């Protein structure tokens, strides 16, 4: 009954699902093909798959779950590779030309043909739910589908469904690591659109996960497969408490009546930390305290910024396993009564907890080793102001001399708009002082 | 020149149909 | 009406002498592939006159 | 389903259009008489993208031919993978312009021009998506420049938005080989700079260089050159024929490229390139092609970037390869060499990583660099073209076509005008 | 040789297509009628006397 | 639902090191310098010792007739090889026929020929009854029928 | 099961027949002696359309050869599938026409004209329902202007309810070859007029113009070019022989392509020509059939339809299709330019779609066009007739022949009101 439809729009988000999706198979038990090969299935209970999967009446499960792309090879990927029968073929929503890192073209001209299609798919898989739980919206703010289509959609979906969860887990640029040039006019047009029509904005970094991947797991020379399947574990351990039954399950709506103070501070890190390789990590304790401690680190934040130079003001730990409440009193205490780690003032009560049974899963074509308990780390801080000023001095030092503006300015989107998205961070960043003082 | 708008107009409410026709009721 | 004459017969000339020669040059590349299967038998033979 | 519609103007443009369609469909596994013989589904699966379907298992390149006389027509035909082309797409007159830029563009040149864009519209309305155009010619000849550029204005009145690049093989310093080149260069780049998209701007004596220094072969011929330019033309369109993990296709590459629109003059690099003795030893990894990619004598323009300053890169690597070490190399390699970016544009290197590498091969690289290094190439055009003009040698034969002095004159200025832009980029700071 | 192989590889006959029509070849297919052989042996058709 | 890259991919010789370690002992401990080789190497996490393990839980010669090899004494020609003809709804090559019957033949009387009667001019039918008359002499103006 | 009657006159008309004879022969597998070697049940089906069941398996086919001469009907009868014919049904006369319609009409062609009726009643009382009639002739002579209107008005007197179809080669001012032409062309469409149910105009120089571009062949010969006028022809009365999707017969073709009685000139055409080179170059789909069947060049007249409107368009499709993608190409070519269309007749298409496509081909089809452009060459024909007769050239033939001037003075008057009544049905409004 708690359902939730992901939206994965770009190439990113499109390469991100198929990570997120296989890992959800592997959670829930079901093959490529479509169906349970338990053959002797045994009733029980047996509907933990419906927050991602429905029932055709046949044996075979659909995900609720729609792919974008304006180009036609990320997308014909999936419908070529071993995850071809598992998608319904109209939820494989392909455009003609892409986006060509341009917002003006994913916003204004191109992504307004797509819009009433990808609409209406979702409105047959709202229909097809009794109780819709959230949307899960996965892109990146690099450029093109995943920032001018995605702006679009969200805002298109704001009108339409009005009060419901819209839940994103955005691919921020790094301050150094990046492979585009108008990425910071993306990402300045992006947050100035999808500030007022999103109520979380979970962050994750490339340059942050390459280094989780060189410290943790030590995979020196990693691909954006090792990303994307650990921002599938860090969205698994989120719809975990959907999913499958424990102590204390956090849905979505208390997920954010903890974690976000106001309206406009919804972007929060997220940190799942038992992330060591299977060659170093049988030979530890793995206990709840040593996770906890994994999490509340500088160096673990899979989001390029110190958290020593902010203040945290919520956070939520979602635990995943064996996992008993006593030791994440204990861990919690100890995180309090340590001093590197600075709670703002009006926020006593800064700890949110929820515990589920069930265990993360390993992927045999991955390298997370088979743990039996985790915790992953949501943290509403104001650390992110940094990353802000960063994005803030790329896009005005080439804003000054209007580099790049004609791609936008002729096909579409005013002059002005870079202007009107500049002052709206800033006032973003106005905010982020207010709260932080 | 006549108008063969009209001329065909009044030649199939006449009942004529073929060419031969239409020339002589011309 | 006499420059639209010979400018068509000029184009079909061209056509009709092109296609000769695509035949032709596909009747060497296949008498030159029989060349060189044969002097593959050869070199084969000379291999083994070698170790003999 | 993207769309790239061909067109290969004069002697150059025919013979590496012709090793071009020679290298992408040994990439797509198509045997010269045209059936399909490869032995995976990617090579299939975006064969629509440059081959129109035929009976049975043919497949038809979609390339436009054109030149005044038939004599490289009539050759590029009988070659090998010649008989794959449709004959009708060979469209040719009866005289030859012939370094006559003038015959070329007014004359008869503007004969052709109705059956060449009925050829051409033709293709394109048998296309449904459409990405764009690629016409390879030659500056400083009469049916590569002058009709070629005359085909770009055509195009550009048609459809104003679809891409356009040029490959045009540019004169060089020393070769020479023409003495009415410089006339016909810039007569050519003058419609080039306001007509094209992306302009690529191929140096013979560059690859020369790049052939003799890195590649030995003291006999280094013309279809070497000839596949050296194909592989590179195939690298920078690699992304819209494979799948990979981070695409990107013309329009992608234009976006991240072009800051202002009149300055699109590039330089293609291609660089996996070893010797004959040294290709059993050497370890083909990322930092060493992104080493030999920014090789200052691995450009395929002979002006060294080491005079200038780079304003945007674009890096298309084609293998399975690491991310991470990827892009921390363009960033090793911009700190390192700061003094040669731009200080106003941060990550000035855009990156494309495409997950087939070319046949052959393990792994690639294919370099395209908006340097302000070629207002060298095109301030030594200007420097001779007003050295021919200012005692009016061989100008006859250009104005006895129609051609007035003031189109001369008006070369002059919009050449003049475009080193002024490259040449205040270079040195304008930010704050 | 290969100039006579040649000669015949370019002058084969085209292939004459498939002489059934669009109905022919969706709504009908082959079937052999069987007609519920007689038990009784009414079969003297002359001289019998009908039921 | 087996695929058909799987048994070519050299990616798929090898097991990860989370699916095949499941306990404190390593099946098959890679040793620091064979860790080092790859990293060096610059080796992908799906070869690399370090995360993948590979253990599991003539012709012949020509013989063609030299007698008329020698007796061609001429080249197949290409050029003449039937001139373009449109028969057959298509342009095809056709070989002209050489021989020629230009010569008209037909004779005044009738005559019978071996492929049935000549056809005879039609003006023989007027010379014992005329039978066909340009001005007739029918009383109905439409002829027997 | 309906007939028609084939009736061939002239030199031309006994031409076109013969090769017409002998491409429906090995339509229906019927070898040169008369037997039917055929291999299907299909053939054999519905072959009294054309052929009179005989002794033995003969099947002898149900056409009238006439000619004031005994020359191309000695050429028929000496040539290939020229003893498939009665010997009764070769009328022809000893006298010469003298290329004069006087002759044809009023002399001696009048004497045999007689004996052409009987033969003809013989064979329309033997058939069993008499579909129609069928002459070919050409306007460019004696025997084919004269002789040929002089039959088709005594068969409309004889039976004036079945339908007829005279195709007739129109003469060009290019092609020539007859000086006293344009008076036999003036002096036969007006008697065309009230007796033709139909007439589908064929030009020589259209025939050699689609020869030279579209079919390249060098050249084209006569051969080849009664072949291809046989082959639009056997693609006009196809339906009457194979079963289909979408039948129609030549009286739905009349009903549904001519819309007032005097504008039956039609533009015939057919759409598989490729040359020998570009055969297999081309996937056979039906939006190229489509286009080139609609494409300019293709029009067998010399008039080009963009200078005029059609008024109504057939297209008859032969083989295996899908209604949806036909139904859709054909309202595309209207919707692309529905400029070049009446807009007081909306959807002026008639699609016929028929299975078994001709012998050696995948699919096929062929066109009907009823154009206000044909106007142009009765202006043509009209524009030398008056040149001649301004000074009565070439008159004392005609004259001394028993006719009149004031004859040839209202024959003219016709002409000029037919094109007037083209031309205005052209410029009238939709409402
Ligand atoms: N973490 C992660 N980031 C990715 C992945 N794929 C792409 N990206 C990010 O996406 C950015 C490039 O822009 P894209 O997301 O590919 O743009 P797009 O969504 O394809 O839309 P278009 O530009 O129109 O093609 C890069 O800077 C990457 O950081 C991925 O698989 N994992
Ligand atoms: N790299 C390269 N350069 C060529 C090739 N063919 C011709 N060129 C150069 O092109 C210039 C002449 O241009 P040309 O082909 O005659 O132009 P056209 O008259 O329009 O055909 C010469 O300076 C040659 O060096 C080729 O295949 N490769
Ligand atoms: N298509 C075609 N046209 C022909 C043929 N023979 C003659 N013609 C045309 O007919 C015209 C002459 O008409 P003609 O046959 O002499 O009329 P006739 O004397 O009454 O038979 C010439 O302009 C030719 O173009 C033929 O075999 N095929
Ligand atoms: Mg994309």
Redesign the pocket.
């Known amino acids: 009954m708690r359902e939730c439809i992901s939206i994965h729009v770009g190439q990113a988000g499109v390469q991100i699902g198929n990570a997120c999706w296989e890992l959800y198979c592997l959670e829930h038990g079901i093959q490529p093909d479509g169906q349970m090969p338990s053959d002797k299935t045994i009733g029980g209970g047996d509907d933990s798959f419906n927050t991602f999967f429905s029932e055709t009446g046949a044996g075979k499960h659909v995900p609720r779950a729609v792919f974008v792309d304006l180009e036609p090879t990320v997308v014909d990927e999936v419908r070529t590779g071993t995850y071809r029968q598992l998608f319904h073929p109209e939820q494989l929503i392909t455009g003609k030309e892409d986006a060509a890192n341009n917002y003006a073209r994913g916003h204004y001209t191109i992504g307004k043909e797509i819009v009433d299609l990808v609409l209406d798919r979702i409105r047959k898989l709202a229909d097809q739910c009794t109780g819709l739980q959230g949307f899960l919206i996965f892109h990146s703010f690099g450029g093109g589908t995943g920032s001018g289509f995605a702006s679009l959609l969200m805002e298109r979906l704001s009108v339409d469904y009005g009060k419901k969860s819209k839940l994103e887990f955005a691919i921020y640029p790094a301050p150094q690591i990046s492979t585009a040039v108008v990425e910071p006019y993306n990402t300045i047009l992006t947050t100035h659109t999808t500030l007022e029509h999103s109520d979380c904005a979970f962050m994750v970094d490339n340059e942050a996960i390459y280094d989780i991947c060189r410290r943790n797991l030590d995979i020196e020379r990693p691909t954006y497969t090792n990303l994307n399947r650990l921002i599938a574990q860090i969205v698994s351990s989120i719809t975990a408490s959907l999913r499958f039954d424990g102590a204390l399950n956090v849905d979505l709506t208390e997920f954010q009546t903890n974690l976000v103070p106001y309206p406009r501070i919804h972007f929060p890190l997220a940190t799942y930390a038992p992330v060591i390789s299977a060659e170093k990590a049988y030979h530890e304790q793995l206990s709840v305290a040593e996770i906890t401690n994994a999490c509340f680190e500088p160096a673990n934040q899979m989001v390029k910024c110190d958290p020593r130079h902010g203040k945290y003001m919520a956070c939520c730990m979602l635990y995943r396993g064996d996992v008993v409440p006593k030791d994440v009193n204990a861990a919690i205490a100890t995180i309090k009564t340590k001093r590197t780690i600075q709670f703002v003032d009006w926020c006593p009560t800064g700890f949110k907890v929820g515990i589920n049974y069930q265990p993360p899963t390993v992927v045999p074509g991955g390298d997370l080793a088979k743990v039996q308990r985790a915790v992953c780390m949501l943290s509403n801080t104001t650390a992110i102001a940094e990353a802000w000023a960063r994005l803030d001095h790329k896009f005005d030092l080439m804003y000054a001399k209007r580099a790049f503006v004609h791609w936008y300015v002729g096909e579409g989107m005013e002059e002005g708009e870079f202007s009107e998205a500049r002052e709206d961070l800033a006032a973003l960043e106005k905010d982020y002082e207010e709260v932080g003082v | 020149e006549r108008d063969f708008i009209a001329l065909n107009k009044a030649c199939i409410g006449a009942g004529l149909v073929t060419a031969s026709d239409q020339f002589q009721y011309r | 009406a006499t420059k639209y004459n010979a400018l068509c017969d000029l184009k079909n000339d061209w056509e009709k002498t092109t296609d000769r020669r695509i035949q032709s040059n596909t009747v060497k590349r296949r008498v030159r592939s029989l060349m060189q299967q044969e002097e593959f038998s050869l070199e084969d033979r000379r291999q083994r006159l070698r170790e003999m | 389903m993207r769309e790239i519609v061909h067109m290969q103007?004069?002697?150059?443009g025919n013979?590496?259009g012709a090793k071009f369609w020679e290298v992408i469909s040994d990439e797509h596994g198509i045997d010269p008489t045209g059936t399909y013989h490869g032995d995976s589904d990617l090579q299939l699966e975006r064969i629509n993208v440059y081959y129109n379907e035929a009976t049975g298992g043919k497949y038809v390149p979609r390339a436009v031919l054109v030149?005044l006389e038939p004599g490289?027509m009539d050759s590029v035909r009988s070659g090998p993978f010649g008989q794959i082309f449709r004959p009708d797409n060979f469209v040719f007159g009866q005289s030859g312009?012939?370094?006559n830029w003038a015959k070329?563009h007014y004359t008869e040149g503007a004969e052709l021009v109705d059956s060449v864009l009925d050829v051409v519209r033709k293709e394109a309305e048998s296309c449904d998506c459409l990405q764009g155009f690629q016409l390879t010619?030659?500056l400083?000849?009469?049916?590569?420049?002058g009709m070629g550029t005359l085909l770009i204005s055509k195009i550009r009145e048609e459809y104003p938005d679809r891409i356009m690049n040029t490959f045009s093989?540019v004169p060089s310093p020393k070769?020479s080989?023409?003495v009415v080149?410089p006339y016909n260069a810039t007569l050519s780049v003058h419609q080039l700079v306001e007509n094209t998209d992306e302009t690529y701007c191929?140096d013979?004596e560059a690859?020369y260089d790049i052939c003799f220094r890195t590649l030995k072969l003291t006999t280094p011929t013309?279809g070497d050159?000839?596949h050296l330019?194909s592989a590179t033309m195939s690298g920078v369109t690699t992304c819209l024929r494979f799948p990979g993990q981070l695409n990107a296709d013309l329009r992608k590459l234009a976006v991240n490229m072009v800051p202002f629109p009149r300055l699109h003059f590039f330089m293609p690099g291609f660089a996996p390139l070893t010797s004959r003795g040294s290709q059993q030893y050497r370890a083909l990894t990322v930092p060493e092609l992104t080493q030999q990619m920014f090789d200052a004598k691995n450009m395929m323009a002979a002006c060294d970037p080491r005079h200038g300053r780079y304003l945007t890169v674009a890096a298309i690597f084609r293998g399975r390869m690491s991310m991470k070490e990827v892009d921390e190399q363009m960033l090793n390699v911009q700190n390192k060499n700061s003094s040669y970016f731009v200080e106003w544009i941060p990550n000035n290197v855009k990156t494309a990583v495409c997950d087939i590498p070319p046949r052959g091969l393990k792994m690639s690289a294919t370099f395209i660099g908006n340097s302000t290094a070629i207002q060298e190439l095109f301030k030594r055009i200007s420097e001779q073209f007003t050295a021919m003009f200012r005692r009016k040698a061989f100008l006859h034969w250009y104005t006895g076509e129609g051609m007035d002095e003031m189109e001369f004159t008006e070369a002059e200025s919009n050449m003049n005008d475009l080193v002024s832009e490259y040449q205040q980029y270079q040195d304008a700071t930010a704050e | 040789k290969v100039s006579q192989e040649l000669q015949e590889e370019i002058n084969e006959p085209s292939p004459v297509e498939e002489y059934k029509s669009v109905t022919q070849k969706d709504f009908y297919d082959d079937e052999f009628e069987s007609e519920l052989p007689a038990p009784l042996y009414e079969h003297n058709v002359n001289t019998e006397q009908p039921i | 639902e087996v695929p058909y890259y799987v048994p070519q991919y050299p990616t798929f010789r090898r097991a990860q090191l989370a699916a095949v370690k499941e306990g404190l002992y390593h099946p098959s401990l890679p040793t620091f310098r064979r860790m080092d080789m790859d990293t060096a190497a610059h080796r992908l996490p799906d070869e690399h010792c370090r995360t993948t393990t590979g253990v599991g839980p003539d012709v012949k010669s020509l013989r063609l007739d030299w007698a008329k090899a020698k007796d061609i004494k001429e080249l197949p020609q290409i050029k003449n090889t039937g001139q373009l003809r449109f028969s057959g709804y298509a342009v095809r090559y056709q070989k002209p026929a050489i021989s020629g019957s230009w010569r008209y033949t037909f004779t005044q009387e009738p005559r019978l020929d071996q492929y049935g009667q000549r056809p005879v001019p039609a003006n023989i039918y007027s010379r014992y009854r005329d039978t066909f008359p340009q001005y007739s002499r029918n009383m109905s103006t439409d002829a027997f029928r």
């Open positions: 103007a004069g002697q150059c013979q590496i030149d490289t312009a012939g370094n070329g010619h030659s400083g000849g009469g049916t590569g420049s093989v070769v080989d023409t080149e191929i013979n690859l013309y050159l000839n330019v």
